[model samples]
Target chain A: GLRRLTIRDLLAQGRTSSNALEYVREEVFTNDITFSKQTANVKTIAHWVQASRQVMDDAPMLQSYINNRLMYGLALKEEGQLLNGDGTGDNLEGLNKVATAYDTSLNATGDTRADIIAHAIYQVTESEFSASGIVLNPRDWHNIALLKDNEGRYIFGGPQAFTSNIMWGLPVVPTKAQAAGTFTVGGFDMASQVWDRMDATVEVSREDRDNFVKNMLTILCEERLALAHYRPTAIIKGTFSS
Target chain B: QIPGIIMPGLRRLTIRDLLAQGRTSSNALEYVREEVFTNNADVVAEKALKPESDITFSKQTANVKTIAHWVQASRQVMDDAPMLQSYINNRLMYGLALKEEGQLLNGDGTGDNLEGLNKVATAYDTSLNATGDTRADIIAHAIYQVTESEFSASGIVLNPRDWHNIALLKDNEGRYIFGGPQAFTSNIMWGLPVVPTKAQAAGTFTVGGFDMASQVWDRMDATVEVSREDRDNFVKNMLTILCEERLALAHYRPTAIIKGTFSS
Candidate 1:
């Protein structure tokens, strides 16, 4: 008959044995793994103006317009980088490249584009992360808003309905930065962050080459920032079927 | 002047503020301006050849030059006295302003020096007015000279001593010409602002179309930087605070500026 031995029994038996082993050799291990710190560089994006000094002085509104234009220009470039940058030289590794591809298995046959978005959100939830928001092309968002019911009524409320940028209880961001027929749904606030090294700045000068002689003023606006994705699986990228 | 300390009455508008400001992105600037020396347009018969005017193109270049200075201080002192850094920066900038005034008026255009206004300005014409002209009378003639060059006279720059002398001049009935000693008013002379600065020599004056005839091109604005890594500063536990600027001056119309002396 076989019998199980406890730690106390093993110790007693070892004490009585002449050449008893007191310890058993086994592998020592730990569950935690070391993670290396990653880095992102800050870069500058700037532009200048060339206009006669008289024009700047006479038309005071022009100054305000130029400043606004430059500020918007920087904002557009930054938005494009945050969505589509390919992690090349001087490019930030943006969200699209790091986000997990949408699981086609979760997409069912005869599903609409909106259904695909729901499936994308399901993928993030199944990854043990909450879906915080959704980003879609403006065209795709318009198509979704225009979906009709079988009774000829608007599916997402009528034109008179008081609606904000929300769908499925999550905030929706419709931007040109995302390509048409494409969408991204993820935990933007939790899984990713944007670090600002410098805020947007505007500077006007006449000391650019030949600008003094040409009676021109140079206006420049720029900023420095880096984007970091903490959990890639928390975000999901997908495409809309025709 | 004491180190790490500032003096009163050191802040005033220098000659740089009187000219038109501009900017350049290169180390050097070159420009060409044309002058029509002779206009021969006259009534012509049918199919007759029109007279041609004589034109001259003058190309000028102004190279950007640097004006800089530095002060040494203990790094600990900088941290203890926070205001000391800004004080030194102001003093250094003021030092540069003072040098800038001298260069704008007296630089001789040799070996990195700017071709100053006085160097290119038309000399005072004593023969154009009365033989025994006072300082005020001489200044009027200088304005005439600028107008004669087809440019409007904008401002007058003179030594404080000369301006004081001009203010003290009395009428034949024993009255101050420019109000009494008790009178306080705008510093105006000949319908123009009088910039009574010591930058000009005693008994001398400069009148010009400052805004219309000249431009100041700045390659870099005045900047102040602190570093302990300069030279032996790191080992000595000291900081080298530097103040510097790069700029150039262009006198578009040389004849528009007039430089003169009171005694001439």
Candidate 2:
């Protein structure tokens, strides 16, 4: 069975938005020792600092039946919503924007494939990071799936035949969001935070005056959220050859 | 290496430097060791490896190694307050840092705040019982675990009470086992700096490999916000002074939590 994803789930475990929201918590800062200790012993700071942005679940699409069939593939867009600034100044900087991207070095040793992933985890761990999970393109994972030792048997599959999304004890989240040849490991829950103001809410209504005359309605879904990467070092940027 | 006499690379920075002068502020971060905020996380077993290998070319499979940690702690701050408000900061984040290590060494990655997360000391297949081993031996065994991984031991963490008890420990003739009272005064145990922290539970203790190269602390500049805009604040004529800094800790190798009851 295919598992459907919500933004909260994506932020909790999946690599897509996991890096942002796992640490998100909204609470009154007043009277809390955590906040009080930082402030003067006797007063309150009227203003609170909150990082916020708006997000949409779907992009604009053509309103037609034939168009849906022929251009359904084109309906998908670049995953820039989750990724940081494309430099147009129209969007906020994203995790990938501030994330340190790394290229895994290739050594002509016993096992280059195994070494690459191990080294990435090491990089994060050595930096005092937990190396929470890894993200990669399905294409790159396929290459990993095909790795075999001289024993003439499947390395990952073993006698049981590996058929899951976990490897090296971490959950392997495959998404088109990542480009082929690149993988990332990060302590999503530890290094970053997502402060939520309004959770994702959906509403559909034919509110436009013109739409009132016509038999069509616009379905709008939006949410107000903020993403902050307190420790960028917690993320390891890695890349390999296809 | 002496405490009062300045070591070659160590400097005693005042609270001001610790607040904003940056990483060079030695005393500012001295408390980090108590939290064992160093290399402590362990890369658990390979979770999933899916690949298809061929005789002609390299195979394609992704290996996933999960990193888990235990309880995340909350911290409060303050050393001094300016007329409006000053910065109050300390090393409570050390426990947070150790959480990364504890999880890697022992966390199963299950459970949530609803049910407390498991710790490494409970999950470790190896343990040292004081009844059969000296406290020194237990410390060495924890250090060995790190050395076995090709890493070196950097420090040991303990509650101040345990540290006191160990400091006063004596042989049959009533001499301190750790040399003498002056020997215990140095705050160094078995050559590694002893970090005494309240972050650790009264009976809890830990030891592990620590290297700044593998541990990281990311922070947002602390901001002091003084305001009189609120309804009560404006009427009371007292300004609200608040300070905050956001940061996170990550450890590449979090392992070797030596916990549980020490009967001996």
Candidate 3:
């Protein structure tokens, strides 16, 4: 199952099977470099580290609020009949698991990490109930590392949720402009007004379909997970570095 | 909705701030008014920054200072004093550099800064033969920061000498001279780095208001010898974009209804 497939190999495999985009994004910075783990006495400093982390200083409850709005919006934005179970074969339960997971994505870009998280959680929740779980949540928050760097902010932060949210499936938009029209966001064509200020604004653009949202969703997944104290302590055995 | 109002407002505010800091290419007093003119006909003017327009918004100038400051100071000295490509290679561009990791600041102005303030000053020093583009880019960034950071943004100081220097280089007609003095103004000045004519030296363009009769918005008549296709394509795209958004159409509007005429 863990085999390398090239474009030529995939091409030979047939057009029906080929789905990868030509250009792909990879970690340019961390892949080559190594960092020392924090051995600052886990039990002693962990609480302090958690407390001292001003990560959500200005935006505490806002994280969950965003996830909820995004969740509801995703729930509402979909093909309603999918949940009625017309043999579309979607699993709505898995989505609730993602929503209730209590983690944010840690992403790059100063302004968009929240959008990314909301989007991914929405997808996770959306997947549980949609007909084609994979098709419905086409872009699942995927990609994992114990932690990732996001502009001096150590993301992939809360390990468990980070791994779950980084689903190997990612969000489906290139930039915020396109996702602005989606569920948790609406009315605006660029940024999220969707379910913002407590359902005050609705925004929409295009479907989530590119690196912008995908990368951002990855970041937000970490932000949410870390905020809720999701950790790496009991990682699913053999699930990490797989 | 807030961001909606903010987009244009910030554009004007940035231009005004740039002028107040003596970094304006146009007259400071006319920034808001001239902005109305730039966006005068949103349909026509959005083209001002479009791809084909010889005169367009410089992406290099868009949100410029923040990235520049980061590049030049925070990162590995990405000063484009030489060329941008070389500076790019040494960037924390693709992956996160260790240097890009967490900070422990309890207050303002702490840690490694690559002398960014001076670099901004030097780029926008307002001297004759100065790099107006670099200076303008930084000032635009500062203006954006003011809004984003609620006026607590760093590196926003004005260099008085550069301000005066810019004032010195301003042509009476309101156009700024960059690169160097050219032959076009030969009728207007003389000497080493040709100084202004007495009329131009004394002329202070305090633009009043839009001269509807003259069909002009500036103190100086800004009649362009523009190609026809640019005018049409700009309007078409603008209409396509604006018309699709009801709120954008209702609220954000063009300042002028420019109608061009062919002359003999």
Worst 10 residues of 2 chain A by lDDT: A35-44
| Predictions in order: lDDT | 0.72, 0.44, 0.22
- Give the clashing pairs for model 1: A206-B23, A207-B23, A207-B24, A207-B25, A208-B24, A208-B25, A209-B25
C-alpha RMSD by candidate, in order: 26.3, 34.3, 29.5
Off by over 4 Å in 2: A1-80, A84-90, A103-110, A159-163, B1-264
- On residues B1-264, what C-alpha lDDT tens digit does candidate 1 reach at each position? 245654677434457777999988897888888866787888989997988878788788888888888888866456435676577778898788778888888878898788888898989886867866666887888888999878889889888877877778877799788887686545788788888777788877889899789889999999889874455654454689988888898878888999876664
Over A80-190, each residue of candidate 1 has an lDDT whose tens digit, in order, gives 677776766546677788777777878777756687788788877655567788877878898898888668877777768656777898877777788888888887665
Q: Cα RMSD (Å) between model 2 and the true structure?
A: 34.3
Report residue A7 deviation for candidate 2 (angstroms).
Answer: 8.5
lDDT of 3 by residue, A7-64 (tens): 1111111121111112211111211322122111000000000111233336768545
Which candidate order results from sorting by lDDT in descending order?
1, 2, 3
Q: Which regions of candidate 1 are displaced past 4 Å?
A: A1-242, B1-11, B42-50
Q: Model 1's DockQ?
A: 0.01
Poorest lDDT segment (10 consecutive residues) of candidate 3 chain B: B242-251
* CAPRI quality band, candidate 3: incorrect
How do the residues A1-242 of candidate 2 rate in per-residue lDDT, one tens digit apiece? 13422222334422232212333222122223111111001111111111111111133343232223322221122123344224222233355665665644434456757567877776665445576667777778777877777867676666465556677877676666677777777777666544544444444444332334454454433343444455555665665753
Model 1 Cα shift for residue A64 (angstroms): 55
Range of the 10 consecutive residues with the lowest summed lDDT in candidate 1 chain A: A6-15
